[PDB]
């Protein structure tokens, strides 16, 4: 696959990047004679997250791990505007549709090339692309089928970008709502299900209500007084309560504002 020329430089030393016949990247370590789906630098970042296991409040612990991941991916440099420009240019607008590894790589390369021309040596493109691809497949393609839904890719990138919190909420709600701005239970379940994979991938889903988000959908609709559909304003008001399935996001913003 042509992208191998480009991304093979994301690894060095005794590591070697390889492609399974299914098109999925994996990493060979000739020193230890092993193979792993995770990029060695992703593994190193994850091992390090154990130094946050002392943090007492789970929403804060999760936000700090996600903040560290955000910075390792350079997604704290990414505005909502620029993320949308890359999504637009790659025609990623049918949210129920699949994108394979090459479409993920292409869209991430447009994002990271632009960040790189805007920032001085902060962005190693091949490395960023490969590591962000690795995070996105770990969140959304655990069995390495080689595809993820467009809505999933947007949920990951937008949730970790540097936009203001309400802009993220508005954007994300718009991705699941109908063309007239309306969200019913099924559609909200779509967003919460994609969002909850993020803390679930860090092994912290038990502090966010568990991996079944149906109880949170019902809670949102009961909060909306059992109306059949909701609009963006009501969803923002519900998020102001920091529902348990999503509280890691607002806390992430507080972690970032607190500096580190």
């Amino acid at each position: 696959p042509a992208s191998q020329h480009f991304l093979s430089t994301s690894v060095q030393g005794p590591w070697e990047r390889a492609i399974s016949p299914n098109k999925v990247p994996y990493y060979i370590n000739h020193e230890t004679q092993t193979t792993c789906w995770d990029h060695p630098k992703m593994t190193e970042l994850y091992q390090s997250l154990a130094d946050l296991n002392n943090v007492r409040f789970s929403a804060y612990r999760t936000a700090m791990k996600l903040r560290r991941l955000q910075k390792a991916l350079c997604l704290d440099l990414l505005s909502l505007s620029a993320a949308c420009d890359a999504l637009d240019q790659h025609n990623l607008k049918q949210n129920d549709q699949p994108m394979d590894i090459l479409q993920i790589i292409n869209c991430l390369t447009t994002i990271y090339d632009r960040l790189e021309q805007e920032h001085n040596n902060l962005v190693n493109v091949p490395l960023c692309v490969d590591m962000c691809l690795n995070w996105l497949l770990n969140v959304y393609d655990t069995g390495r089928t080689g595809r993820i839904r467009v809505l999933s890719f947007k949920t990951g990138i937008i949730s970790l970008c540097k936009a203001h919190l309400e802009d993220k909420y508005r954007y994300l709600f718009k991705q699941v709502a109908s063309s007239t701005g309306f969200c019913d239970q099924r559609r909200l379940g779509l967003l919460l299900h994609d969002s909850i994979q993020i803390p679930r991938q860090l092994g912290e889903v038990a502090s966010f209500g568990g991996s079944n988000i149906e109880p949170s959908v019902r809670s949102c609709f009961q909060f909306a007084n059992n109306k059949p559909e909701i609009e963006a304003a009501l969803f923002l008001d519900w998020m102001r309560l920091e529902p348990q399935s999503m509280v890691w996001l607002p806390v992430l913003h507080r972690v970032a504002a607190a500096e580190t």
Binding site: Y26, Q33, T34, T35, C36, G143
Partner: peptide, 13 residues
Amino acid sequence: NMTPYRSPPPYVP
């Protein structure tokens, strides 16, 4: 679903 986890190709010298 089912086979949410699978190993990568085995090491080959």
